[PDB]
């Protein structure tokens, strides 16, 4: 029996589960086998750990050209967008009080705990940092990032000659989050249960995931939420440097997919990517809360 191995970002879990189901229905006998991990880590499984996949889907298309081309990939297709929000539930502390204008004041309260993923492994993780630093200029409060992140982790920040803020992420084992304030996981979707059970009050994550789980959420200003092409110039004012030296830049969230050039089942992969980009895939993404490009 043939097998199609798909490596994908954690946030793609729900829609990709549907694609696997539809693809398997259209291709009896073929077993689509998915493996999820933060996008940077999903890519490194291929580029550093010697693992092989037929399809690689990332929550940040830019990781394909920056990490895979041309040794492990030669192209990428942009197929969806997303938006960063602050998720919560009816049991989250101060949930009935939080809104777009005061979310960071609520997170500043000592009895409130928030979660975000590992910036060294997951776009949702480095994006939580980008959004929070961009919030300083938007709300005219130069201590939002300092208070929420620098004071509670091993991350550090420097200002570049061009005025760009550069966030430095230490080795994963050295991020050392203040556990009374932060819960960290390798990828964003690993924090869903923590939010649902109340171990954390707020969660930096994609709007699509919040909608899929039925979480409530605070919409953030488009100038800082990485959702719109219109604000691309503002988003680029922040960058994150991973422990390995790779630098990612604030940008509109665009998902990208590719077929590694060392894939074992490239032909089947082509049919899968065709389904993803086609009308059936498009519909699955929109029904799961992710707008097209
Ligand atoms: Mg399967
Ligand atoms: Mg600051």
The span from the CA of 161 to the CA of 182, in Å, is 31
**Residue 63 near residue 240, CB atoms below 8 Å:** no
Fold of 82-253: D-Maltodextrin-Binding Protein; domain 2 (3.40.190)
Return the DSSP state at 72: T
Residue 110 host element (H or E): none
Residue span(s) of the chain under CATH 3.40.190.10 come to 1-81+254-293, 82-253
Query: From the CA of 4, which ligand is nearest?
Result: 1
CA 31 – ligand 1 centroid, Å: 4
**Which ligand has the shortest distance to the CA of 272?**
1
Fold of 1-81+254-293: D-Maltodextrin-Binding Protein; domain 2 (3.40.190)
| Three-state DSSP state, 27 | coil
Closest ligand relative to 149 C-alpha: 2
- Cα separation, 108 vs 93, in Å, equals 12
CA of residue 218 to ligand 2 center, whole Å: 21
155 Cα: distance to centroid of ligand 2 (angstroms)? 13
Data resolution in angstroms:
1.6
124 phi/psi in degrees, rounded to 5 = -60, -30
Nearest ligand to residue 25 Cα: 1
How distant is the alpha carbon of residue 97 from its chain centre? Answer: 26
Element (H, E) at 87: strand 84-88
Task: Tell me the CA–centroid distance for residue 290 and ligand 1, in Å.
Answer: 23
- Dist. CA 262–CA 152, nearest whole Å: 41
Instruction: Give me the sign of the Cα torsion angle 274, 277, 281, 285.
Output: positive
């Amino acid at each position: 029996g043939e097998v199609l191995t798909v490596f994908h970002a954690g946030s793609l879990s729900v829609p990709f589960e549907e694609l696997e189901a539809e693809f398997e229905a259209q291709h009896p006998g073929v077993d689509v086998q998915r493996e999820a991990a933060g996008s940077a880590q999903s890519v490194r499984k291929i580029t550093e750990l010697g693992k092989k996949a037929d399809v690689l889907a990332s929550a940040d298309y830019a990781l394909i050209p920056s990490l895979m081309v041309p040794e492990y990939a030669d192209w990428y297709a942009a197929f969806a967008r997303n938006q960063m929000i602050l998720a919560y539930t009816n049991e989250s502390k101060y949930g009935d009080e939080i809104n777009t204008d005061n979310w960071y004041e609520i997170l500043r309260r000592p009895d409130v705990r928030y979660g975000f993923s590992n910036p060294n492994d997951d776009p949702a993780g480095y994006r939580s940092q980008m959004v929070t630093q961009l919030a300083e200029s938007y709300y005219n409060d130069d201590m939002i990032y300092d208070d929420l992140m620098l004071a509670n982790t091993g991350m550090t920040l420097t200002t570049e000659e061009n005025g760009t803020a550069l966030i430095h992420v230490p080795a994963s084992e050295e991020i050392s989050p203040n556990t009374s304030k932060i819960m960290l996981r390798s990828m964003e979707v690993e924090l869903s249960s923590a939010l649902e059970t109340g171990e954390i009050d707020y969660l930096y994550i994609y709007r699509s995931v919040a909608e899929q789980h039925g979480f409530e959420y605070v919409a953030l200003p488009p100038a800082i939420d990485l959702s719109s092409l219109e604000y691309a110039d503002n988003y680029s004012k922040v960058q994150v440097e991973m422990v390995n030296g790779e630098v990612v830049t604030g940008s509109p969230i665009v998902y990208g997919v590719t077929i590694p050039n060392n894939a074992e089942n490239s032909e089947l992969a082509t049919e899968f990517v065709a389904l993803l980009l086609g009308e059936t895939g498009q519909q699955i993404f929109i029904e799961n809360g992710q707008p097209p490009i």
